[PDB]
Design a protein around this ligand. Structure first.
Ligand SMILES: [Ca+2]
Ligand SMILES: [Ca+2]
Length: 312
């Protein structure tokens, strides 16, 4: 398996558990710090990063009824410039760039308490697919499915329904949506970290998935596995393989990695493309920093880059 070693440039550092890199509709860059703590209690933060100086600004420190959050994944909305944030303690949050935020749901469509979320991905129809590796959200005691299989997958539909689409995962982490050339959602790819597996489902409609299958195999016997992921414009899937110093690259059909990207750090966590460029920003947990490198091509357009009132 061919391995490439591109030049990695440091952007910023000293961000505990650096995760969820994302660009909003104005081109601003944000990341989350899920591991920030105060007196032993969660006090996760959402930061805006100045790409010119690397300076950090905390715009939001989520807390609900005295319970601090553990923000871990982000997606920018299309119809409004707001961020949807998966929080391991609070569930799903919608955060405004001014720092104000709102809790999306405490229970799902079946009346069951919400589970803590880790990452999410919009499909082009506007539905948000979410991984939930933690147990019930605060005030429930914090737990995670690293050993036991109670991780779930949710879909937050355009008409506001929070539906659990599947469960029994051992720490579902990264997630991505494969689209057809016509823009129609085709497959859902979900990373199950410790098992070194990538799973796929066929998307038949909002919150409707079938044919669960082992889509890809993550290399290594190291502790960890697939974390965050994203597609490039040719539908190649780039996957951060936490613990093995590489980002794996899969072809549209999955299976075994077609290429590997060697990183100057052991723990790549998540990544995101800068709109309209080949530049990929990567968060990593060895130094808790954010880096950037040039890929071979542009990234796949995110939902927030699509037009609601477009002709073609
Ligand atoms: Ca993650
Ligand atoms: Ca991303």
């Amino acid at each position: 398996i061919p391995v490439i070693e591109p030049l990695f440039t440091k952007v910023t550092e000293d961000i505990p558990g650096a995760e969820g890199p994302v660009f909003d509709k104005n081109g601003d860059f944000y990341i989350v710090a899920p591991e920030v703590e105060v007196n032993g209690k969660p006090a996760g933060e959402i930061l805006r990063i100045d790409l010119k100086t690397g300076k950090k600004t905390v715009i939001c420190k989520p807390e609900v009824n005295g319970y601090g959050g553990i923000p871990a994944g982000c997606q920018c909305d299309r119809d409004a410039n707001q961020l949807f944030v998966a929080d391991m303690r609070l569930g799903l949050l919608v955060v405004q760039t001014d720092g104000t935020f709102e809790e999306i749901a405490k229970k799902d469509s079946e009346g069951r308490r919400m589970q803590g979320c880790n990452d999410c991905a919009f499909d082009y129809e506007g539905n948000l697919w979410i991984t939930a590796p933690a147990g019930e959200v605060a005030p429930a005691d914090y737990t995670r499915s690293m050993q036991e299989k109670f991780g779930s997958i949710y879909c937050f539909t355009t008409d506001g329904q929070m539906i659990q689409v599947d469960t029994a995962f051992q720490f579902p982490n990264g997630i991505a949506v494969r689209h057809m050339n016509d823009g129609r959602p085709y497959q859902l790819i979900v990373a199950e970290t410790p098992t070194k597996k990538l799973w796929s489902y066929d998307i038949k409609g909002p919150a409707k998935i079938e044919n669960k299958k082992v889509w890809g195999h993550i290399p290594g016997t190291h502790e960890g596995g697939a974390d965050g992921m994203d597609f490039d414009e040719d539908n190649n899937l780039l996957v951060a393989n936490w613990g093995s110093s590489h980002i794996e690259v899969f072809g549209p059909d999955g299976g075994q990695p077609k290429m590997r990207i060697r990183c100057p750090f052991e723990k790549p966590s998540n990544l995101h493309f800068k709109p309209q460029t080949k530049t990929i920003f990567v968060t990593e947990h060895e130094n808790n920093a954010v880096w950037k490198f040039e890929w071979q091509r542009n990234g796949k357009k995110q939902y927030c880059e699509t037009l609601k009132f477009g002709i073609f």
